[PDB]
Amino acid sequence: IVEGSDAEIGMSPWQVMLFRKSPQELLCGASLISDRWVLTAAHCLLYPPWDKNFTENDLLVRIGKHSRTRYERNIEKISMLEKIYIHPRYNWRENLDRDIALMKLKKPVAFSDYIHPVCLPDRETAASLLQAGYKGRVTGWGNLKEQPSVLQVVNLPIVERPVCKDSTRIRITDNMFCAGYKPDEGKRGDACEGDSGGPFVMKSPFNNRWYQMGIVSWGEGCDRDGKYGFYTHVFRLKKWIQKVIDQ
């Protein structure tokens, strides 16, 4: 995260570190959506251009963390993957269309003060909150510019689709949205490398709950003027989500 702040303790209790065994390193962000299910970007597990193809046994999930590098004894939970599932129409050749994967954990995790699932959106919450100018929040442990001691946080506005498209020569799909401040605006900030697969969340003003509207997908640089971060449209893929979950 570039131009973010240090997270508060328990601010993002659904935040999940994707952790590589050897080398023992940060791969991606991710999110906890129930006791046995973790949501991430497909490109965290499978991205042939940067030589990436992970199997279950290469990877761990670390839940409940705040420190990037410490082993947070009595606080974090490190879990094992039973199964990875990449969306079958995931487009890694072109534009990262349908950049989404689910990970089933080998056993359920116990919730705690630091470990709690985020909500997935329903149609109406999507239709009501996913509007240009409305802000969501991104968190993670990725680089501070194009590395943090602790989880970082930034609040970013959703950007009008035409602007997203005119910022880039990539072909945007309806399964993605973009966010970020415009050049003229007073504020800046962005995700960066190591934040990807993490959650873009919004807080409903109707029921006071946090909804995962986005997954951190890609950007051209980190926090460049006239560029924006691209996010997987979670609601749009939500039928795939509850397919694999009830099956």
Partner: peptide
């Protein structure tokens, strides 16, 4: 069920330091 309600904020009715920036944008 209990999703999106954080043990140290909403479940104790405490606000975080920047959530108001979000709500004001809506």
């Amino acid at each position: 069920a209990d999703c999106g309600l954080r043990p140290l904020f909403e479940k104790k009715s405490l606000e975080d330091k920047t959530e108001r920036e979000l709500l004001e944008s809506y």
